[PDB]
Amino acid sequence: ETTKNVTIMHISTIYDKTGKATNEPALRAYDTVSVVSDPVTINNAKFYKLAGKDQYIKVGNVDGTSRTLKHNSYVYKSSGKRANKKTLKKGSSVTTYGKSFMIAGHQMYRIGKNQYVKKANFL
């Protein structure tokens, strides 16, 4: 196997070679793991194979998904405070990692370490 090191950006279920979830302990955000460098496709979904193991994680939890903003947006911390006073502008492409989180009552995507943007603001 040719492998590379990646940072988990979102809690990640461990799947088997058929894309079925296992009960193996989930990988946790900001841990580093060795994966086979090229993703695999299972059921038209992309996964990283963990190096040396028949275990697979979703690429969206590592490389993310590029999404376009339909509204000007603030960036929040998990506490609910604004992370900064910057505004991400409508039409910007922003990478989001995994499934949205509930932050201060709103569904939000993680865009960075302790940085979140409201899901409703994306196209």
Author numbering: 335 to 457
What does the paper say about this structure?
S-layer proteins (SLPs) are self-assembling, crystalline proteins coating the cell surfaces of many prokaryotes. We determined the atomic resolution structures of all functional domains (I-III from N- to C-termini) present in the three S-layer proteins SlpA_ac, SlpX_ac, and SlpA_amy. The Lactobacillus S-layers are anchored to the cell wall through interaction with teichoic acids (TA), either lipoteichoic acid (LTA) or wall teichoic acid (WTA).
The crystal structures of the TAB domains (SlpA_ac_III, SlpA_amy_III, and SlpX_ac_III) reveal high structural similarities. The general structure of the TAB domain consists of two cell wall binding motifs (SlpA_motif) which are connected by a short linker and arranged as an internal homodimer. Mapping of the surface charges indicates a large, highly positively charged region within the interface of the two motifs that extends to the C-terminal part of the protein. SlpA_amy_III NMR chemical shift analysis of GroP trimer and GroP pentamer titrations identified two areas corresponding to phosphate-binding sites: The binding area 1 (TAB1) forms an elongated cleft in the central region of the protein, and binding area 2 (TAB2) is located in the exposed region of the C-terminal part. The main difference between the two binding regions is that both SlpA motifs contribute to the TAB1 located within the cleft of this domain. With NMR titration experiments, dissociation constants of 3.5 mM and 0.5 mM are determined for GroP trimer and GroP pentamer, respectively, indicating that longer GroP fragments increase binding strength. To obtain a molecular model of the SlpA_amy_III in complex with two GroP pentamers, we used a combination of molecular docking based on the NMR-derived chemical shift changes and classical molecular dynamics (MD) simulations. For both TAB1 and TAB2, reliable HADDOCK models were obtained and minimized in energy. Sequential analysis of TAB domains from different Lactobacillus strains (P38059, L. helveticus; A0A0PECX7L, L. gallinarum; Q09FM2 L. crispatus) reveals high conservation of residues located at the proposed TA-binding sites.
